[PDB]
Amino acid sequence: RDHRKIGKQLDLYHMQEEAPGMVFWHNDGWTIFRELEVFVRSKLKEYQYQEVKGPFMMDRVLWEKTGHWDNYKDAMFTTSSENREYCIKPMNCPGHVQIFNQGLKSYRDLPLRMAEFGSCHRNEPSGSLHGLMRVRGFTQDDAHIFCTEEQIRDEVNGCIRLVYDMYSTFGFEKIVVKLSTRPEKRIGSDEMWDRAEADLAVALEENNIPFEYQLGEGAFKGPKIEFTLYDCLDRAWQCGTVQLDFSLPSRLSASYVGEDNERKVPVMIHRAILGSMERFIGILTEEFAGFFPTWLAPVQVVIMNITDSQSEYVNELTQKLSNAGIRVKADLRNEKIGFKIREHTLRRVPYMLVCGDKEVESGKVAVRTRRGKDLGSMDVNEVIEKLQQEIRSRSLKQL
């Protein structure tokens, strides 16, 4: 169960010293990554997020206005052009505020939920880099929610359900939630921090969530929540973060018209659910040890002939499955059928369709699974509908 070894074994990705901490996503690893995006998007639709894309670098003077420059300038890559210094973005937050600031906002536009699969780069020490887990370039399932003070409970609610709904899809049902203890140096009124804390307290009670407090210092900009999942090995992984923010929107001159016709500053809620998706993919690789569920499997079906007689039939099938939206490949090589079956089993391909002479005469296929289960000869349309149901439901298990 080593995601770097399995990654090489299944041709998912690679890295090289030329781009330390930066992932070369091969076709099959990119297939997994994009199937995560579709999943995230399907929940974005459900909970009504926008999806945006911001620029990959922005003026240094802007980053200095966030206040992150002072604290974290050592972690940001910098480049210049025409005697102007830019920073490769390490976070998507300022960009989203930039999009919010276009056009006059009123209370009726809030809550405004803005999501981005944003690529960010940090200048991590090369010695801390480890596979997909600790990298320099990553994409996170980022989002930022702009809302009034009164909306914090309802919004945090939505983040909480989102965390548990998504993690369960992967088979993660053991989840620890840690609140944060407020620092002595913080931004925002004492009054502002205690109403928000009541909103957080009421939201956690509502979802019946036992929370611990985090023993270290919290964030200076607002209350913060972290979610930790446990995998089948009972290992703890911290992925979800919900970070209330009373500092960035005032610093970047965000405002909206309230019902009282007054320019208030909106509250910002930063939230990721999976965290870094490169990291998350590593986690899934170890969780399943390379036996990806059908919907995540890079290749879902391989169809094989026994001799060249059945070769035309297989190509028919491969196209027929591919029009049905199944990642399928035809294996017409000059190897014997046991060799093909063992080989595609070692490569963790979920289903394997064998086409002997009786299969062609019959309009069916012999089905073997990557666990060695023999499901017998089944109608072609039957295999298609069953496979589609498993894909769309994102079943963790097979037939």
Ligand X SMILES: *C(=O)[C@@H](NC(=O)c1cccc(O)c1O)[C@H](O)Cc1ccc([N+](=O)[O-])cc1
C-alpha distances in Å from residue 152, one per residue of 24, 159, 313, 355: 39, 10, 59, 58
266 binds, among ligand X, Zn ion, its own copies, none (CB under 5 to 8 A by kind): none
C-alpha distances in Å from residue 109, one per residue of 21, 49, 92, 150: 39, 12, 21, 14
Give the active site residues. Answer: 93, 122, 140, 142, 144, 224, 270
Binder to ligand X among 93, 163, 204, 273 (CB under 6 A)?
93
- The answer to whether 241 contacts ligand X (rule: CB under 6 A) is yes
Q: Cβ closer to its own copies: 111 or 218?
A: 111
- The answer to whether 88 contacts its own copies (rule: CB under 8 A) is yes
Binding mask 250-289 for Zn ion (x = CB under 5 A): --------------------x-------------------
Any binding-site annotation on 96? no
Q: Cβ closer to ligand X: 4 or 68?
A: 68
Query: Residue 146: beta bridge partners?
Result: 112, 268
C-alpha distances in Å from residue 294, one per residue of 301, 326, 327, 352: 9, 10, 10, 12
Structure tokens at 164: 């548990």
Binder to ligand X among 30, 72, 193, 291 (CB under 6 A)?
72
- The answer to whether 270 contacts ligand X (rule: CB under 6 A) is yes
Binder to ligand X among 87, 95, 137, 142 (CB under 6 A)?
142
- The answer to whether 93 contacts Zn ion (rule: CB under 5 A) is yes
Residue from 237, 242, 235 nearest 199 by CA: 242
Q: Cβ closer to ligand X: 135 or 326?
A: 135
Say if residues 370 and 352 touch (Cβ distance below 8 Å): yes
Residue-by-residue DSSP string for 235-291: -EEEEEEEEEESSHHHHTT--EE-TTS-EEPPEEEEEESS-BHHHHHHHHHHHHTT-
272 binds, among its own copies, ligand X, Zn ion, none (CB under 5 to 8 A by kind): ligand X
Residue from 391, 397, 396 nearest 328 by CA: 391
What residues are designated binding site for Zn(2+)?
A: 93, 144, 270
Q: Which residues would be at the binding site for ligand X (CB under 6 A)?
A: 68, 72, 75, 90-91, 93, 122, 142, 219, 221, 241, 243, 270-272
